[PDB]
Amino acid sequence: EALLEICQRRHFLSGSKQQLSRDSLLSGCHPGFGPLGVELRKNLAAEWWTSVVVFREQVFPVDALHHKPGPLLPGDSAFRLVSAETLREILQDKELSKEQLVAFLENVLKTSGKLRENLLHGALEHYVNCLDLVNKRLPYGLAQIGVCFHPVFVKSIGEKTEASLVWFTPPRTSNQWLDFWLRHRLQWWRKFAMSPSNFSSSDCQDEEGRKGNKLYYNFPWGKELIETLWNLGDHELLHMYPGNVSKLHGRDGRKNVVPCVLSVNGDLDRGMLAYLYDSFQHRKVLKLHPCLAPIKVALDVGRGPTLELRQVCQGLFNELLENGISVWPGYLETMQSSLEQLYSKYDEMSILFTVLVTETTLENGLIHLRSRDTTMKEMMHISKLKDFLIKYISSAKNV
Amino acid sequence: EGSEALLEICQRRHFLSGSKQQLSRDSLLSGCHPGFGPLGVELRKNLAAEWWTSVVVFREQVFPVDALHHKPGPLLPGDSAFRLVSAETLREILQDKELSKEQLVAFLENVLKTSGKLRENLLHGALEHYVNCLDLVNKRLPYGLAQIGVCFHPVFGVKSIGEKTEASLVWFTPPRTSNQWLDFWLRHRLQWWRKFAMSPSNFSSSDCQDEEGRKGNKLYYNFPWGKELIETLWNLGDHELLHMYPGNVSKLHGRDGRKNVVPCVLSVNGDLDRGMLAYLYDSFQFTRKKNLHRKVLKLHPCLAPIKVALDVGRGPTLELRQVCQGLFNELLENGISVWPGYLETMQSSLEQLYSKYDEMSILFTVLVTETTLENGLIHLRSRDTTMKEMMHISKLKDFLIKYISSAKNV
Amino acid sequence: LRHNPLDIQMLSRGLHEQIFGQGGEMPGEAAVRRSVEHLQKHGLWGQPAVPLPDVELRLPPLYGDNLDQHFRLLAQKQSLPYLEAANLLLQAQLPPKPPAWAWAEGWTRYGPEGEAVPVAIPEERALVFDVEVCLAEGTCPTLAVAISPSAWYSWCSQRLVEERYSWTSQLSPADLIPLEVPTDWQEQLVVGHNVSFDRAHIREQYLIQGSRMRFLDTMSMHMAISGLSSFQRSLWIAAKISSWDWLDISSVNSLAEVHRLYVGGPPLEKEPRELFVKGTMKDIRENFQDLMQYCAQDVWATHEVFQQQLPLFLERCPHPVTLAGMLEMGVSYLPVNQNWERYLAEAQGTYEELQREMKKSLMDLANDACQLLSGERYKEDPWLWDLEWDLQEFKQKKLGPCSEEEEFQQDVMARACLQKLKGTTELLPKRPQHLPGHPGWYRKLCPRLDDPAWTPGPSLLSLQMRVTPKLMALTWDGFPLHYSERHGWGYLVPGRRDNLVVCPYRAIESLYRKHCLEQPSYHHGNGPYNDVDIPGCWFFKLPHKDGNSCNVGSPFAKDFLPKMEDGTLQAGPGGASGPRALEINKMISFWRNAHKRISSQMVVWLPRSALPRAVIRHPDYDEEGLYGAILPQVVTAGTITRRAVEPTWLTASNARPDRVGSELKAMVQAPPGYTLVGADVDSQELWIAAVLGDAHFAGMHGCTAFGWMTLQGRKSRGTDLHSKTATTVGISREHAKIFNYGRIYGAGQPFAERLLMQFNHRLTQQEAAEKAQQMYAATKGLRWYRLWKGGTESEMFNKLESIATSDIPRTPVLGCCISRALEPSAVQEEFMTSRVNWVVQSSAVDYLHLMLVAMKWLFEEFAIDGRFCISIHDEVRYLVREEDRYRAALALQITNLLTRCMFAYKLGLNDLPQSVAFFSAVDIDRCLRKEVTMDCKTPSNPTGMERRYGIPQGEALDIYQIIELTKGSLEKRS
DNA sequence: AGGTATGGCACTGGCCGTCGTTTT
DNA sequence: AAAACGACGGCCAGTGCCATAC
């Protein structure tokens, strides 16, 4: 309760107190996130992109579209892109009103578009073209982050943003690569945690018999699924490309073989909620990890000649932004609050540091610094604060 | 002519995707092509990050927003387009299977009343957040909301979906300032577009009046067949906000100076996929022209997708490979994108590699040799000059960081 | 009388009665017939007259017998307290300079025995004053020294004595020097050298109401006595034609040479290290005593110079009007508001974007040209074949595995390999080499990596560099440009055997053959100089606006833009690029030269408690606005003609479309409840020359043909000056305008024969010489009457040469002497045209002084609430509270009338033509403009003044509208 | 015998400094 | 290992030309 109430008050979530419910957030049909949630998600996504893609010479981004055209496979209860305009188009004449009420069901099941359910199929549609980029060397990957659409339960739409990697491999080594990716993904989820024992893994088996793994986070009410790994084999590539298999071959061991497909997919909105709960563990504060927290530092102004203090705050604000530090410009508010409320507000926003500029800054350049973690206060000279902050961020990242 | 030679290059170096038949002008302009190749995806990501830098990062009072892709709930009847209907929900006229005949048209009201729609613009969902986000700035009336995302457009054996990536600012202004802010943002965005252009005279604006007679501006790029629209600005006034929120206007008031007013909405919306295509046409194409046949894409350093090529000379393979791995890890740890050319067995001559990298628009080729293991000097070729220089390996990182960081200030 | 002889309309009955006596005199019958027959031989004796409406006024009471007595009494009353204060400085007995300079903040007064005492203000009637400024810190005053008749004084800035992390960069009067006293005769005089700079640092000088204080400048009194011509300046410096006697009595304007001439003794010493212009505040704190010593030294030398100069000035310009004029010229005042900052920002941004657009286009050409190095292909390019195409050597000192295991080991392995190879830096030379593998020409275009202003590429390139037109492959009439070291820019014409290094006779021949396919010698104009010795070609100069002997310094100059649009000058990269580059150059040329001066103007912002109540209690007042002023640093006499000089405001361009900066002046904006009123003298110098010619010939207005034409040519008949010139020989009236203005400054047959050739290409040189001969016979006549006479203008030139040949030339109206450095004793017949022009220019300066004296009188007499704003040689402006704005226009018109009548009186003419008596209009405006209706749209403010700032247009009123606004009275009762 | 002033940039030659090569 | 010198790049003053004003 309290955590979500605070997250609504401080613009992590969006909507209203009636719409705020955990089951809706899990289902992906809540009203949406606030700006702080957007920034937090962008941080998660960039740390995922750097961890998975950047340092790999053979993982490439892929551009799957949001919908599938053409004729579907019938008998699926799922969304259709169909229009009442086309209901007047089909009636090119009035007299087509024959058996039409059942028949039109089979027609809309035959000729309509579909929303994207997963990123896998869009990646598989590019395999033959992207094989040229690696000079057909068989092990390579495609990665994408994007929203997918899921039927809920008068059904409604769940929206989920998902991070996906598809890894192609010789079948000889598939289970080794599976164990490797399980190791990396689990340790990636553990790095930023304040209690990494709350992240867990399990073995599981497909109804076929194929081997897979599942990753969980222990929310206060129970474990929830966050990410899944499956060794899918080769069925889908053959089904998507009947006929002359020799276009499917790449090179392993100086010989042609059909690759095996590994699928890795994680839900980032789940991850966001997991870290929000993890950070919250008499004071209250959200101790988000320094790499993830959306706004690093707040600037304020003390008592004195406002027009002089504001121009130096402006200079400091621009100095911090030029070096890539995100800043909350509290100095616009004229510090109408008492300092107790100002600290409580910043502790709930998970701000790392707060800087007060005062007459004495104009005298000698000393600013007050507070740290969110320690609640300790010290003086520092304005000249050096930027390099202190860069140091603190690097010494967080390298541990 | 020139245009097809350009599209030959763009597919062969994987900026575009799909066959010739899928890449005609109409398909690209409509947004129903198969998609962009990986270099195009990186080019678009760079363009979007430059846009985010110029619009949001330095702008003390703009904030991000996240409008959903679909509209839930009940909807106005008579809008023509596709809706999220299903064969499962179709049974609400099939309660008796023997019903039939041209009486069916009743079911149009059912499908209109209770089926969702895919969003067509970003403004409406931003306006849904006005009341809530006005708290962020203590009602101080100049504030903005920005986001980037895909939009869906009906185009025309019957129908197809266009997908377009768009970037939108919604800016709230006290009514007297509205034309001042219009002129401000018009100049700002037109200079932003011209900044990266190689021929900024090919960008232009004109004044327009809507069918109701509200003022606005349109920005065009002069493709080789004619102008195409790339961005639009409107002063919309207050009516849409009033319609969204009927009743006590006291909820809507913000603070202007010391007096309380309802703002004019300013709307800014630009097309990023057309932006990408415009810069692609810009970057390409009198004896200094008649005899420099060289093919190259002069993409701006902030935009060009791949910055450095790494290659090896002939020599002790393990030593060169370990030093190239060191270089590669150092460069990537500082955010410079690199092509691992040292991993493809060197079938080509140097001339062929230079041609390939110039088609890919790569900024710099770095070459490692036997002599580097002794003196630590590496060769560097400039894309822009084709001249070769020697540089010591200890400084390369800082040189590249300087070159890119200062490219903003050229 | 309604008319005089020759039936020209004359001053109104009541006006002439009020101004002149009824006594008068008759010209004489012989003078009349001498005039009429002269007008007969020229064809002027037929009347186009259109009688102007008569006008009547009750003028303010004059003083004494006649208008000269009146103006003397006026100027004596204005000046007396300051000449009184000045006489106290001629007899001061200065104590010894104090042994140790005091450290404290503010003002300290020193007793004998050197005892420093703190005093809030110097409390003195007369002072010599000097201010020092640390240039690194900005514009705040740093320290100063003053001397009175009885004590030494010194001042310290708080920014020098204290230490702080920051001070406000916006200036306040609280950070300027206090000088004038609280509410003795107490009409303070301050004297200095370049005193206006010291004036700029005085806090009370910025208040919107006036002050008693006035300023006198040693440099301007030097310029009056023995100031040198600008050419004499360079001669005098080269000496450190044949008379050379003037050099011993003259000098340059610097304080050292002025002390040397007037005082002598041991030379003055400068500080060698120049701490105030090049040091930093730490150095000022450390070197304190030495700096304050050098300041007292310059102060003492200024006091010594002043005592010598004043009796000579009082001798050579005895009429009090001159001194009163100079003393009023020293108090200009320009109001400004917060729009100034926005104007500066918008100008800088627009200049930057246009310069970036130009640089990008040149940089792409520079980049692509590097490809000509391969295969030595550059040897065949008819441009660039002669650049430095050299390269400088670099200088030394003498499968299918699984996932990995122990990835952390391969990581540390590669990192340690890289650190090991990184450490070999010890073998590099200490000085980093600069682009040795790029060509030398390209090498020069690129900054060094050490420069804090480095950018990638060849970003130093400009249109005005000699390389640039070779890159654009500029062509003239089909021929490639070439630069000659002797002769500047020209072009190469191919085709010459007998040679009259790989390019010769080959590539250029082909290129021109191609041009001729697309459409002795075969070409003419600035004909072939065999001094330049390119094989195969001939070299021709580009033509210059000033004729063949000037050198063209850049083809991008304005004067070539017509030939670009005509298609005579062309670029290679195609028909859009050439004219666009020329457009941009025209757009930015003014801002390039002036932006440092303009942006570093010193501005002081007035707080709430300082403003008038008529501002704060006004409907148009705003909170969060800014109000302030700029004080121009005018030198009251900077020229041999004694004109004012100022580095910025006297050369400010008028608002123009397609010029980026032009709205500079329109940013001077009256505060709420105040207004600008002023006017511009119509055709001043032509009238002065005409009336001098009339006074010399026969003592009647319009007795000479040039005088009549100046008064009676109405453009519709063929009878104005320019129509007549265009009638004597077949040229357009617009060309005759040029010939006339040239001839007035003393041009002769070389000037006219040149312009003739330059306006009709069919003319032979003999025809031009003959037509010039005839034009000069018609205009000025023949040089003597035997074996000037017989021209429309002869008597004016006779009179001017008469004045200039006198043993002591004096200005005809007010009697100021010319400079000793130009009297015929020191200079036999050198500098003759300067001496002739001086008569008119100095007369116009006397006219300016008379107008200033009259306006100060009428404002103090009718208690008008207004202030002098600025003047620009022939304009005056006044800042006025809006309630008096219509009375001010009447005072201006009365001043114009009294000035015009005074001028004629000293020439011995007792009347004035009715047409010149008043300003054609008076301007009432909220900002400064050349015309009242101009909206001043520019590329830097395309929406114009009325939309960006809401300043409306104003009113332009003739005398009659001022009457119907005022009923003809200046009384506050109306 | 075209007048009086202001000021900018591009270019050239002369001079002192210091770092690397030939030396007590 | 202190001391001698030579070549080269950096700094400034001076000359030339173009741009503003009346």
Numbering used by the authors:
A (entry chain C): 67 to 219, 228 to 355, 368 to 485
B (entry chain B): 64 to 219, 227 to 355, 361 to 485
C (entry chain A): 69 to 251, 260 to 316, 342 to 499, 530 to 631, 645 to 663, 730 to 997, 1049 to 1235
How does the study describe this entry?
Accurate replication of mitochondrial DNA (mtDNA) relies on the high-fidelity DNA polymerase gamma (Pol γ) to faithfully copy the parental DNA to the daughter strands. Human Pol γ coordinates the activity of DNA synthesis in its polymerase (Pol) site with self-error correction in the exonuclease (Exo) site to maintain high replication precision (1–3). The catalytic subunit Pol γA consists of Exo, spacer, and Pol domains. The Pol domain adopts a canonical right-hand configuration, with subdomains termed Thumb that binds to the upstream (−10 to −5 region) of primer/template DNA, Palm that houses the catalytic site, and Fingers that constitutes the incoming nucleotide binding site.
As structures of Pol γ apo enzyme and ternary complex were previously determined, we here determined the structure of Pol γ–DNA binary complex using cryo-EM. The overall structure of the binary complex is similar to the ternary complex [root mean square deviation (RMSD) of 0.713 Å], except the following regions. Relative to the dNTP-bound ternary complex, the Fingers subdomain of the binary complex rotates ~30° away from the catalytic center, adopting an “open” conformation. If a dNTP was to bind to an open Fingers subdomain in the binary complex, then its α-phosphate (Pα) would be 13.1 Å from the 3′-OH of the primer, a distance too long for phosphodiester bond formation. That distance in the ternary complex is shortened to 4.0 Å. The open-closed Fingers conformational change is critical for the formation of a catalytically competent configuration, which has been observed in other high-fidelity DNA polymerases [see review (15)]. In the binary complex Pol site, Tyr955 protrudes into the N-site, and the templating nucleotide Tn is lifted from the coding-competent position, thus it is unable to form a base pair with the incoming nucleotide. The 3′-end of the primer in the binary complex is in the posttranslocated state in the P-site.
